[PDB]
């Protein structure tokens, strides 16, 4: 058919990936050579960020101006890719210029993310983050590539969480730009991708693998809508593209693949219901294309979900503490970003009005309208599914709603300027001035929306026993000695040791296994968190070393061989625990179990005191 | 015109029946399941939000169905069902795990529950606490509540929540009926939903004042139309306004006073607007005002006559203003500002705008008259009128929003969907926040022991769990009916569960003016210093009132009993007083129940 334009599209996407990687590596390497002052205790970084993301917006205006008239038409595209990548990198990695940890440091939720990135760094295979022998549940897409990049190029996996997060976000933005200029004109592509990137950097920043899909949802929604409606010879490239995107998101983020599949099913149903006339021959074509999309998606996404569904087909999984047991305050109320007094609220209101008035006679507007409606239906469905003692995690779809509404708002701004620009001549400069002022006023609020994240990132001890605040380190400065003791006693590589700890930040830095994960929610259902916790709590009612060693040789699972406990309450070794009280708000409840210092009394234990911790290792 | 009147009566009766049926069925279904508590989990707020969204979407569907007109009857029935269901879902879902209304049995719910418990064991009209007195507080809501709680066998402390929710739903349905008789159906639905939402947000703690707060806009407009007309026409709205004032006089005194004030203002303005046109048509509004006033007094006398026939010869010597809701910064502030603009720009050419403008002017005149009357050592309570002001301004804001949408739609046609979208978003964003503005009330409702001895959030109950034992002991020692023995306590939540006559009220501003609260308190403080057991019997029988027979008093230091009533202070009695071989003294926990046996 001589449709080589597919080859050109693949070449453009590969060039986007290469350019984003190059910019995000060079910029970060250059930044990390200056010894900047701490962000929470100096304005040096928050001013250089503003300078950078103003110089990367004036540059975009210049590039868009150049594209309108010029014989180049190719330096404009390269400049656009370079400038969106640089905008993302400067917005994020400049405030984090003196620290080595990502947002939130090693705190509440980064613990298991860093643990899984550390797991997939000393092994190529797919293994669970904590437990031993199990196939992984959480999608190992981002972490596998991060682990390969950290195993190849030196640096430990806790240290390749900031650079790889920023680089992945830059890749997502630079690929979203390539996806937009295939559909709409170049200037509109620049404006829309900059708006969506600026929103994701402010809202889906802490989790740098939901941000990629969050940015790529609008272009892929438009591409699927235009390609599910084609008739009998057209859009078969868009169908395969949407299927590939859903398969890619299956191994990258489960909530967003669920939402995307929901939206695609709604799109196919709406199209099939709409064209129910002209016989049934034309009313089934959207269903055939939906079948093809599903067939590609659940064969690209089965390279990571097959081991789990093969081992969980027979094993007694618990699944009564599922990861979707969060019902926070904002998870019991719909989100209306269109109506909040602020610039984001104004642009979301403009997007809502544009979608309402242009849904029926536009290709992007219809797709974005169906996306927003599916977001709201998903929210209502999760609220209703709380009856079935489960949730659909609808409170993580707020950033997605913001991104969709901001893309529609940029579209509506362009449409309005081009509509009321007929009744006059000097409106493009004034509209550009107002829009640039608004963009500069918003993009300097990114480091201030993320202020708690940056403060936590600057006051957490990294894996070198240092703080990014250049203050005395916390408790994490003893872990090197602890690991040296563990490796000296057992004599086995740290992939073969099972460690029972209460401070789960030891296993984030070091690739030891675990007998109990940090939280009941992000724990493998095959692991039987409840029964492990029951067995652990039973040990509190023991007093003899022989009884304890007999208990440690009767568990169905693999027993701990290294215990990292704390002093407590007149010769008892306290290990803090956790429990899922889901219907209630603090969905997790912490409680303490204590061992009475006589269990670890044999010639078959080696008990040492290192700082506050006591390290009882079972001698081989 | 008997057909019009008969159809109006039929529609009002249908509204009452539909609201009752929907509220009862929904409340029973909700109470069937054992939901988690509100202060801990969020499973009840989520279901409240789902129900509200469903009801609002259904109302939009009904309004759309009205256009394609062949199902007008079904559209009206569905409208009534949906407004009633919206009210019931908004209130009774967060209170799905408890048996107490908002605030439970806290500061002011105690005498409301006490009066509902009074009017359940007897049908006549008597005071809530004191014996042998005619009631002062208007027993309209509580009488029907007592009949409903005595016919179905429910203890009267338990009928409070379902009866309050049902009454509020009935009020909303009747308001909707009045609106689609005055204006077109779609505007009726829209303004009824707006006023109902604001009423639920701000006037729910008092469920018999919210019945009338939601019914002031329709009746203001109806009375304005009924007094404005100058012919043999409009003689039915006059009777309707008179009957509404008579119904409000037995339901809520502050709002009947305010309504009579506003009606007098309306009649005066109408008479003075035609004074220079011949006095023949300048006194017609005054004649219609007199006809309104005769019916209102005739209907209010059935309740206020026993008190006034006794308060005319007895010692009756006892008893946040000026707010601007259109200037606050919220969605409500925006819609109230739009309503104020509409009232300013449309008062002289519209009847609803004129009526609502006169209502708001009356609210502010009342507010500025209360401040002046503070010089007279008294106030008109012009701080419980603020929810009324919010309701009036929101009704005006709904009218102004619709009229502005029409004016904008003169230039183009596609502004209707955009307005509908940004109005539905705002309606949902406000109505889903109602459980959060009532959060302190729900929190108190869930952490209060009910009449069975169990808290709402399944925690160890408080001291309200020994009451059944105290009751059994009293009814066994005295050997008489409950509403025959007078009880002197300072934990007044015992009398708000059981129909025992009291010797003292909670605070002086709840007591019956005929009750002489100050002299009773002085007599108790005189008992404080009494010496021996014989002096107690001597000084009990000299009281001009009915002396107590049962004393329910706690433990105190060094031979005291420490009644600890309020005026707040503490009064204690030496143990010697009850040591006579007449009183039966026994400890039922932290209490010392001393009953003067016959
Ligand atoms: Ca962990
Ligand atoms: Ca009382």
CSV table of N, CA and C in Angstrom, one decimal, chain A residues 327-329 332-334 336 338-339 341 349 353 356-357 380 383-384 386-387 583-585, chain B residues 35 40-43 45-47 49-50 53 329 331 417-418 421-422 425-426 428-429 432:
chain,number,residue,atom,x,y,z
A,327,UNK,N,-9.8,4.5,51.3
A,327,UNK,CA,-11.0,5.3,51.2
A,327,UNK,C,-10.8,6.7,51.9
A,328,UNK,N,-9.9,7.5,51.4
A,328,UNK,CA,-9.5,8.8,52.1
A,328,UNK,C,-10.7,9.8,52.0
A,329,UNK,N,-10.4,11.0,52.6
A,329,UNK,CA,-11.4,12.0,52.6
A,329,UNK,C,-11.8,12.5,51.2
A,332,UNK,N,-14.3,10.1,48.9
A,332,UNK,CA,-15.7,10.1,49.1
A,332,UNK,C,-16.4,11.3,48.6
A,333,UNK,N,-15.8,12.0,47.6
A,333,UNK,CA,-16.4,13.2,47.0
A,333,UNK,C,-15.8,13.3,45.6
A,334,UNK,N,-16.7,13.7,44.7
A,334,UNK,CA,-16.3,13.9,43.3
A,334,UNK,C,-15.4,15.2,43.3
A,336,UNK,N,-14.1,18.5,41.2
A,336,UNK,CA,-14.5,19.5,40.2
A,336,UNK,C,-13.4,20.5,40.1
A,338,UNK,N,-12.8,22.3,37.6
A,338,UNK,CA,-13.3,23.4,36.7
A,338,UNK,C,-13.7,24.6,37.5
A,339,UNK,N,-14.0,24.4,38.8
A,339,UNK,CA,-14.6,25.4,39.6
A,339,UNK,C,-13.9,25.6,40.9
A,341,UNK,N,-11.2,28.7,42.6
A,341,UNK,CA,-10.7,30.1,42.2
A,341,UNK,C,-9.2,30.1,42.0
A,349,UNK,N,-12.3,25.5,33.5
A,349,UNK,CA,-13.7,25.9,33.2
A,349,UNK,C,-13.8,26.2,31.7
A,353,UNK,N,-16.3,24.3,29.1
A,353,UNK,CA,-17.2,25.0,28.1
A,353,UNK,C,-17.0,24.6,26.7
A,356,UNK,N,-18.3,21.1,26.1
A,356,UNK,CA,-19.8,21.1,26.0
A,356,UNK,C,-20.3,21.6,24.7
A,357,UNK,N,-19.7,22.7,24.2
A,357,UNK,CA,-20.2,23.3,23.0
A,357,UNK,C,-19.6,22.6,21.7
A,380,UNK,N,-18.1,7.3,40.4
A,380,UNK,CA,-19.4,6.8,41.0
A,380,UNK,C,-19.3,5.3,41.2
A,383,UNK,N,-17.4,4.5,44.4
A,383,UNK,CA,-18.2,4.8,45.5
A,383,UNK,C,-19.3,3.8,45.8
A,384,UNK,N,-19.9,3.3,44.7
A,384,UNK,CA,-20.9,2.2,44.8
A,384,UNK,C,-20.3,0.9,45.2
A,386,UNK,N,-17.8,0.4,47.1
A,386,UNK,CA,-17.6,0.3,48.5
A,386,UNK,C,-18.6,-0.6,49.2
A,387,UNK,N,-19.7,-0.9,48.6
A,387,UNK,CA,-20.7,-1.8,49.2
A,387,UNK,C,-20.1,-3.2,49.2
A,583,UNK,N,-12.4,-0.4,56.5
A,583,UNK,CA,-13.5,0.5,56.4
A,583,UNK,C,-13.1,1.8,57.1
A,584,UNK,N,-12.3,1.8,58.1
A,584,UNK,CA,-11.8,3.1,58.8
A,584,UNK,C,-10.7,3.9,58.1
A,585,UNK,N,-10.6,5.2,58.5
A,585,UNK,CA,-9.8,6.1,57.8
A,585,UNK,C,-8.3,5.8,57.9
B,35,UNK,N,-24.4,-0.3,59.2
B,35,UNK,CA,-23.4,0.4,58.6
B,35,UNK,C,-22.3,0.8,59.5
B,40,UNK,N,-15.6,7.6,62.0
B,40,UNK,CA,-14.4,6.7,61.7
B,40,UNK,C,-14.2,6.4,60.2
B,41,UNK,N,-15.2,5.9,59.6
B,41,UNK,CA,-15.1,5.5,58.2
B,41,UNK,C,-15.8,6.5,57.3
B,42,UNK,N,-15.7,6.3,56.0
B,42,UNK,CA,-16.3,7.1,55.0
B,42,UNK,C,-17.2,6.4,54.1
B,43,UNK,N,-17.7,5.2,54.4
B,43,UNK,CA,-18.6,4.5,53.6
B,43,UNK,C,-20.0,5.1,53.6
B,45,UNK,N,-20.6,8.6,53.9
B,45,UNK,CA,-20.5,9.8,53.0
B,45,UNK,C,-20.5,9.5,51.5
B,46,UNK,N,-19.8,8.4,51.2
B,46,UNK,CA,-19.7,8.0,49.8
B,46,UNK,C,-21.1,7.7,49.2
B,47,UNK,N,-21.9,6.9,50.0
B,47,UNK,CA,-23.2,6.5,49.6
B,47,UNK,C,-24.2,7.7,49.6
B,49,UNK,N,-23.2,10.7,48.8
B,49,UNK,CA,-22.9,11.4,47.5
B,49,UNK,C,-23.5,10.7,46.3
B,50,UNK,N,-23.4,9.4,46.3
B,50,UNK,CA,-24.0,8.6,45.2
B,50,UNK,C,-25.5,8.9,45.1
B,53,UNK,N,-26.2,12.5,43.8
B,53,UNK,CA,-25.9,12.6,42.4
B,53,UNK,C,-27.0,11.9,41.6
B,329,UNK,N,-17.2,34.4,50.5
B,329,UNK,CA,-16.4,33.9,49.4
B,329,UNK,C,-16.6,32.4,49.3
B,331,UNK,N,-19.4,29.4,46.8
B,331,UNK,CA,-20.4,29.2,45.8
B,331,UNK,C,-21.7,29.9,46.2
B,417,UNK,N,-26.9,24.3,27.1
B,417,UNK,CA,-26.1,23.2,27.6
B,417,UNK,C,-24.9,23.6,28.5
B,418,UNK,N,-24.2,24.7,28.1
B,418,UNK,CA,-23.1,25.2,28.9
B,418,UNK,C,-23.6,25.6,30.3
B,421,UNK,N,-24.4,22.5,32.3
B,421,UNK,CA,-23.2,21.7,32.8
B,421,UNK,C,-22.6,22.5,34.0
B,422,UNK,N,-22.3,23.8,33.9
B,422,UNK,CA,-21.7,24.5,35.0
B,422,UNK,C,-22.7,24.8,36.1
B,425,UNK,N,-22.5,21.0,37.8
B,425,UNK,CA,-21.3,20.8,38.6
B,425,UNK,C,-21.3,21.6,39.9
B,426,UNK,N,-21.8,22.8,39.9
B,426,UNK,CA,-22.0,23.6,41.1
B,426,UNK,C,-23.0,23.0,42.1
B,428,UNK,N,-23.8,19.8,42.4
B,428,UNK,CA,-23.3,18.6,43.0
B,428,UNK,C,-22.1,19.0,44.0
B,429,UNK,N,-21.3,19.9,43.6
B,429,UNK,CA,-20.2,20.3,44.5
B,429,UNK,C,-20.7,20.9,45.8
B,432,UNK,N,-22.9,17.8,47.9
B,432,UNK,CA,-22.0,16.8,48.4
B,432,UNK,C,-21.2,17.3,49.6
